Amino acid sequence: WXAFVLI
Amino acid sequence: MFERFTDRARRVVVLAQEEARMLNHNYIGTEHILLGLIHEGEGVAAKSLESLGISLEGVRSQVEEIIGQGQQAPSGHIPFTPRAKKVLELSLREALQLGHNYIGTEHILLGLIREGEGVAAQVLVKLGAELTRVRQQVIQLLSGYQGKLEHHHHHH
């Protein structure tokens, strides 16, 4: 969160 | 906030990355979130679109025709676009304003439409998925399914 799967 | 996502909502985001990769797009835009929602195809948001009379295959094809296909293979982790980040932000906002402490596929759908400017909202609104109408449909389906359609993260 909130930029990539899954961050 | 991904630890609050239902199993299906987490799967929608995981599939959105592969929908971008399959189209040679090194970005996950609103279009690929919607493609991943259709690919998951079974949760509250998918059933809500169907119950409004909207064809999921029609949505998928209209998105495809707009966005075309890229030229080069994306390796690794594909980044959300700024408008896709706004979708995720509005998914949390829509859940909180519905009184919900989780994020399901229904909130991703509402976030796609409330974002408004991206390819997903353009296609969905054209086909009749105006935001108010969708939210009322979502509420009806959550009542009808009684928590039995979309399991919440590690939930009893």
Residue numbers in the entry:
A (entry chain B): 1 to 7
B (entry chain A): 1 to 156
Article passage:
Phosphorylated arginine residues (pArg) serve as a degradation signal that is recognized by the ClpC:ClpP (ClpCP) protease, a quasi-proteasomal particle critical for microbial protein quality control, stress tolerance, and pathogenicity (Trentini et al., 2016). ClpC carries out its quality control function by acting as an ATP-driven unfoldase that selects certain client proteins and translocates them into the protease compartment formed by ClpP. The ClpC protomer contains an amino-terminal domain (ClpCNTD), two AAA (ATPases associated with diverse cellular activities) domains termed D1 and D2, and a coiled coil (M domain) inserted into D1. In the active ClpC hexamer, the D1 and D2 domains form two stacked ATPase rings that power substrate unfolding and translocation.
Of note, the mycobacterial ClpC1 is targeted by a range of cyclic peptides that deregulate the ClpC1P1P2 complex. These antibiotics bind to the ClpC1NTD substrate receptor domain and thus have a pArg-like targeting function. The best characterized ClpC1NTD-directed antibiotic is CymA (Vasudevan et al., 2013), which binds to a hydrophobic pocket located in a remote position relative to the pArg-binding sites. The CymA binding pocket is highly conserved in ClpC1 unfoldases, but is absent in ClpC proteins from gram-positive bacteria, enabling selective targeting of the mycobacterial protease. Guided by structural data (Vasudevan et al., 2013), we prepared a series of CymA-like cyclic peptides and identified sCym-1 as a high affinity ClpC1NTD ligand (KD = 0.81 μM). A co-crystal structure obtained at 1.7 Å resolution confirmed that the sCym-1 mimetic adopts the same binding mode as the native CymA antibiotic. Moreover, the crystal structure revealed a possible linker attachment site to synthesize BacPROTAC-2, in which sCym-1 is linked to biotin. The respective alanine side chain does not contribute to the sCym-1:ClpC1NTD interface. When tested in our biochemical assay, the sCym-1-based degrader stimulated removal of the mSA model substrate to similar extents as its pArg counterpart, indicating that derivatives of the CymA antibiotic can be repurposed as BacPROTAC components. Importantly, these data also show that various ClpC1NTD binders can be exploited to develop chemical adaptors for targeted protein degradation.
